[PDB]
Structures are given as structure tokens and as C-alpha cells.
Amino acid sequence: DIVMTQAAPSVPVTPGESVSISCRSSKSLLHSNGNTYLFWFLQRPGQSPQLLIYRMSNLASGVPDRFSGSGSGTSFTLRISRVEAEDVGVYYCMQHLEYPYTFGGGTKLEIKRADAAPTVSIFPPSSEQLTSGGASVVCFLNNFYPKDINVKWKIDGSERQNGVLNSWTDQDSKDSTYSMSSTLTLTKDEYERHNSYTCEATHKTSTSPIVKSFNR
Amino acid sequence: GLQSLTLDQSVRKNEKLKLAAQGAEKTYGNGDSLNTGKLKNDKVSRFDFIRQIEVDGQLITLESGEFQVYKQSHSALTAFQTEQIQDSEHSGKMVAKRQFRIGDIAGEHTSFDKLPEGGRATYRGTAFGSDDAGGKLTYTIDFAAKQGNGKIEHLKSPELNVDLAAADIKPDGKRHAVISGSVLYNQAEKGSYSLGIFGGKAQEVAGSAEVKTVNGIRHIGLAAKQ
């Protein structure tokens, strides 16, 4: 088979700037008919890959003027001229010169935004959940830059460390922010067995830990 | 000579045939007329061609190459020298691929029921195949016997210089006078041929031959006149 080498697993770029993502084939992708059989796609998390470039340089219909593609025969480059927040994703290169069609490993386009502060929100277990037998105290530390953040849970004052899950967001396609959710789960009785519950967010932007609590 | 030629086999129902020469280009559809009047008689005229169709709003080129027209006074024929073609079959790419095939054989067909009732007529003209329009066609028809025979000479490929074996004149589906026979190479069968008789006084013949060679079946365009 023909191998597509996308060296960089990721590529940093700041908004308004210029980026380049390089691909590499194990064979000249230029056909004797003159056409170079190379595609470029973008795949945003939870979505199907979208076409950007066909025939190595041509821009697929509905793709911003921003985008462009060039190449030698074994070396190809995708170029975004003035990078917007919505370009955040994974760029795959694909050859369709000969069967089997092969893709590049991928290159994650990471945006380098200016450090942002979380907007921490706390919610007590649902009235619906409690009647089901459980109790999930959820906390949302949203729209912060960068990804490096840690959360703590205080039950009446005592540290809560076991039975809590943290889900992290992929870089936001509107503001290039990051977000995450913390979920302390207990039983119906265990939760009612205490009064105060709080969230302790620790981020680079604030030395003084970020707190949000509720009392019954 | 023949002033117009109707393109039928040369451009199918949902195709467009773009012809270009000396900077000008015109597009034809099935049933459209080709102005052969402007072309030189007894010679092959060449055009660049692109055969196209439209798929869900986009125009697609199926094949391209050279389109050839041979003009007589009462008959004419077209042929295609493919150079590039769509391989919609396997690698959906436009692939360099050369093939030669006859398009339309047209003109004023002589009726089988209005042929000369006797005498012997000799026809002299051209045999043309892939990359070679220098062949000479000689054909003789005996109108008393209603039989014809001939030969192809002066083609660069030796296996294409064949005998057009004696065959009967017969009426076709439209009662046009046609001769369909066997092709011989050094007296042995190597293919088939068919010629129509054209002109009010059976002035001309036009048609084609298919010859088996070591390189595959080759097509030869044929046209001769008294």
C-alpha cells in the first residue's frame, strides 16, 4: 500500500495567523493524466469527516477562501491563511491514486488563545434521581484557557475524593476555550446525611481557589 | 460533395459532441447535422473531439481524441481515434487509452431495387485506420451477378492489406443495397466487411472492415467512387 505520513500529531496556531499541515506519500500521487489524487478533510469531534481539498489544490464547494493546498508529488501542504476558531479539529490527508485508499495519521489543529477564567456552576442532585435511589452533585467549570485545571469537593467541610468523574471538552469552535464537568455521585440516604456541598476549582488565572457551594 | 451528414452513432441520445478545429468549436447532439460541404472531397478531415454528458448538474467528459471525417459526393463516414477515456469501470480516472472505431456511415443509399441491371463498375478510394489514412481501396461490382469483391492496399500495418472476398449484394432492412462479406489475408479468413452502395447511379461505396491481427481487432473505414 501507499503510506501517508502526517508527522506532527498536533500544530499550534493563534487566531488571525497562518497555519500549515504537511502530508507525505510513499509514492508519487501524480497520475500520468496530470492530476494528483489527493484529498484533505476536517473532522470535528462527534462528526463525520468533511471534504476541504480535492485534486491536491482545488477547494471543495462551500469551503472558505481561507483554505488552500499545494504539493510536489510526495510532499503536500494544507494551508489556512487567516485561522478562525472554527478550524479547530483533525486534518487527514488521503490518497486515491490506487487501491487501497489510505489516510494520514492526523494533525490536531490546536488554537493558542489568551488565558481565560472558568465560570463554575454547581447543581444539587435531581428530584427525579433521588426517587430513583441515587444522588449526583454536578459541577461545571466552563470556558477557561488552558486545559490545566483541578477540582476538589467538600462535603460539610471534609474532603470528598472517591466517586467523582471528570469529563473534558475538546477546544471550543467558537472562542477556543476549554471546559470540563465534575460529578460526585452518592446514594439517596448518603447525600441527605449531610448539609453543605461545594466545588473547589484551581486555575492559573486565579491563585485564590474558585469556590461555588449550596446548603439545604 | 456531400453537403451534410447526420450524426447518429457518433453522438448518443444524452451526449454532446464538442468538435474543434483551427480555433473554432461547435457542439452537436444526436440527430444534428455536420456541415461536410465545407470539407475537401476524397480526404480525411480532422477535428479535436470531446464527448460529454451531464451528471446531477456537473458536465463530465467521457472521451477525447481526434474525430475524423471522410467526404465523398454522395456518402461520407466518421471515425473516432480515442486518446483518453473514462475508466468508470475500475479506477474512476481518465486514462490514456487509444482505440479506433467507425462512427456513422451516411449518404444517399442506392436502393437495392433501383440498381443498374448489368455491367461491371470499378471503385477507387481510401482505406483508413488508426494513425493511417493512406490506404487504397479498390472494389468491383458486377451488377448482372449482383456480386462485389475488392482489396485494401498501401496501409502501414501489413495484416491490414486484405482481400475483400466476393459477396452478394443484398437488401438491408430499408432495402438499401449492401454487401457483407469475409476479409482474407493471404487467401485465409481473418475478419469481416460491409459496404453500402451510394448515389442515384451507384456512383460510390462506403463502409468498414474488421480485421483480426496479432494486436487485436482493428477497424478500417472504407470509401470509394467510380
Residue numbers in the entry:
A (entry chain L): 1 to 216
B (entry chain A): 30 to 255
Task: Give verbatim excerpts from the published study on this entry.
Factor H-binding protein (fHbp) is a surface-exposed meningococcal lipoprotein that binds human complement factor H (fH) and is one of the recombinant protein components of Bexsero® and Trumenba®, two recently licensed vaccines against serogroup B meningococcus. Anti-fHbp antibodies can elicit complement-mediated bactericidal activity and inhibit the binding of fH to the bacterial surface. In the present study, we investigated the structural basis underlying the synergy between JAR5 and 12C1, two murine IgG2b mAbs. Here we report the crystal structure of the complex between the Fab fragment of mAb JAR5 and fHbp variant 1.1 (also referred to as peptide ID 1), and present a model of the ternary complex of fHbp bound to mAbs JAR5 and 12C1.
The X-ray crystal structure of the complex between fHbp and the Fab fragment of JAR5 was solved by molecular replacement at 2.98 Å resolution. Continuous electron density allowed modeling of residues 30–255 of fHbp, and residues 1–218 and 1–216 of the heavy and light chains of the Fab JAR5, respectively. The interface between fHbp and JAR5 is formed by 21 fHbp and 30 JAR5 residues, which contribute a total of ~800 (on fHbp) and ~700 (on JAR5) Å2 of surface area to the interaction surface. The epitope of fHbp recognized by JAR5 is composed of two loops comprising residues 84–91 and 115–123, which are localized on the more polar side of the fHbp N-terminal domain. The interface formed by fHbp and Fab JAR5 reveals notable shape complementarities, with the two epitope loops of fHbp trapping the heavy-chain complementarity-determining regions (HCDR) 1, 2, and 3 of JAR5. Epitope residues 119–123 are located near the interface between chains H and L and make interactions with both chains, while six residues of fHbp make direct polar interactions only with the heavy chain of JAR5 (JAR5-H). The six fHbp residues directly bonding to JAR5-H (Asp85, Gln87, Gln115, Ser117, Gly121, and Lys122) are asymmetrically distributed between two loops consisting of residues 84–91 and 115–123. In addition, while loop 84–91 is located on the periphery of the epitope-paratope interface, loop 115–123 is more centrally located within the interface, and it reaches into a groove of the Fab JAR5 to become partially sandwiched between heavy and light chains. In agreement with thesestructural observations, the SPR binding data confirm that the contribution of loop 84–91 to binding is smaller than for loop 115–123; the fHbp-JAR5 interaction seems mainly driven by residues on loop 115–123 since the mutants Gln115Ala, Gly121Ala, Gly121Arg, Lys122Ala, Lys122Ser, all strongly reduce or abolish binding. A model of the ternary complex fHbp:FabJAR5:Fab12C1 was generated by structural superpositions, showing how the physical separation of the JAR5 and 12C1 epitopes allows their simultaneously binding to the same fHbp molecule.
